Structure formats: structure tokens, C-alpha cells
Subunit: 94 residues, 4 copies
């Protein structure tokens, strides 16, 4: 019945939204970090986490990481939002 | 049957409690950190985590973060506890 | 039927084991850290994590934290292992 | 029916794949860290995470940890991939 087709579209939508929201959080945290790293205070040490190690990196390396990561996240988020878009439309047609 | 209505209220209550407890933990960890940061020892470096980066911050920045975060958590916790309150009352009326 | 009573005891046992194993992991990680902190190398900075902040602590503070945490974990682990013990015995009697 | 036997093989395969992928991620993160640690920049502080403590370690200690961890992960990954191999073959024979 339509109720079942809708529930399954809703289940898919929730899973996509959950993945998408996790990526936006990480993306926003890195943008916040970029604002601090590029602020006026002269010295701020920065570390990058790799599994269970924290390795010191430079301001330039940190900015590079933030910019590349944002690109990967923006792309993944755009793709997921377009899938959410399609599903919301199907749900609307029902 | 009442058993089913109760089970569904119980399911909702557990999910709210789980979210609430996660927030109280983070809130209490930051209050503990504040006590240390404002203690007598002269020098303690502090870092703030943003996704996979750790960025050095000052004592004043750390205290600001702790106070703002506590406000956000206290508010979210109060709202969830009020929802738990309502549900516990419904469960009692049944 | 006995199969159902056994499945439910098995479900409970798995959940207890999962909680217990998580605590033993954290406990063992802190014991490993203690071995390093008390080793010969003269200077090793140490930080303690509180939610999203890392705060510098001394060797003595780190050892204190490790010892107290081990006590809390050992106690929680002993209590869970005794519950696992009871269940395994019930499963055996069936 | 074959559909049910296949679903159960698929369920097992997904769980194995999920464990395997988690290990490959950690393994790749440590290999990335090794590349940075052994790069030209003269001074980079390194910390290792043990539960809620971060303890400073040397470049040599970090490399040792990365190499041992890779061995443990490579072995666990090879064993899981061989189990995935078997299941994919069963699924093919059905
Ligand atoms: Cl440092």
C-alpha cells in the first residue's frame, strides 16, 4: 500500500539525512577552526589526528587540510542533498 | 492495549533519556576542565578539538567556550527533562 | 520454550559482555599509558581530554587519574563479570 | 528458500565488511601519519592517545607504533577478506 512505499522512502531519507548531517558537522567544525587559525594571535600550535596519534602540523598545512576536506565534504553533501530532494518529491507525489 | 501505549511511551522516554545523558556528560566534563584551568598551576597549555584538528587556545578562550557550551547544554537538558517529566506522568496515569 | 528462555539469557549476556569489554579496553589503555609516563625519558608532556578540550596536566596528575579510573573500572568490570557468571550458569542448567 | 539463505549470507557479509573497513581506515590514517612524521620538517611533536590521555612520544616511538599496528591490522584485514571471499563465492553458487 502507499503507506508502505512511503515508509520505505522515509527510512531511506532518514539514513541519507543522518549521513549528510554528520558530514556538515565536521565541515562546519573545520571552518570554525580555520577562522581561529587565521586570526591575529601570533602563536598557536596545531595538531592533526590520525587514528590514535596527534601529529604537529603548521598553520599552512592546517589550512590546506581544511580546504581539501571542505571540498570533499561539500561534494558528498551536495550529492546526498540531491538524493534527499528526489525522495522528498516522491513522498510529495504520493 | 494499555501495555502497547505504555511500551511506546517507554521507548520514547528511553531515547530522550539517552540524548539527555550524553549532554550532561559533556557538560560535566567541561565543568571539570574549568576547575583545572582556573586552578593555581601557572602554565597549562590548552587545545580545542575541531573534527580532526586540535588548535591551541588560551585560558580565556577555553573558559569562554566552557561557559557558552554549558548554556547550550543546560538549555537542551532542561527541555529534554521537561519532556521526560510529561512522559513519566502519562505512564503514571495509565 | 527453553530455546526462547536461552535466547533471552544470551541476549542479556551479550549486552553485559559488550559493556564489560569496553571498560576493560579503556582500563588497559590507561595502564599502558602509566607504563610510559613512569618510564625513564625525562620530559613528556601529558594532556587530559574533557569533551572537546585537551588540558595539560602533570605526570603526578596523570598517574592519579589513571589509578582512580582503574579503581572505578575494576569495580564495574567485577560487577559485570559476576552477572555474566550467573547467566552462564543458568544457560548451563538449561 | 534460497532467498533466505542468501539474505543471511548477505547479513554476515555486511557485518564482516563493516569491521574490515573500520580497520583499513585506521590503518591508512597511520600510514598517512608515518609519511608526515618521516618528512623533512625538523620538529614535530607527537602524542599518542590512551583513552582520555594524550602522552607525548618520540618520532621513533611513533614509527614503532605505526609499524606494529599496521601488522595487527593487515593480519585482521586479511582474515576478514578471506571470510568475505568465501561468502561471496557461496552467494555466487546460489
Ligand atoms: Cl604541546
Amino acid at each position: 500500500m502507499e503507506a508502505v512505499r512511503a515508509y520505505e522512502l522515509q527510512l531511506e531519507l532518514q539514513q541519507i539525512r543522518t549521513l549528510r548531517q554528520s558530514l556538515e558537522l565536521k565541515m562546519k567544525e573545520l571552518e570554525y577552526a580555520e577562522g581561529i587559525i587565521t586570526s591575529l594571535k601570533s602563536e598557536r600550535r596545531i595538531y592533526r589526528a590520525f587514528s590514535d596519534l596527534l601529529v604537529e602540523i603548521t598553520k599552512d598545512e592546517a589550512i590546506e587540510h581544511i580546504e581539501r576536506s571542505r571540498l570533499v565534504y561539500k561534494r558528498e553533501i551536495e550529492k546526498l542533498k540531491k538524493r534527499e530532494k528526489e525522495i522528498m518529491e516522491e513522498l510529495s507525489k504520493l
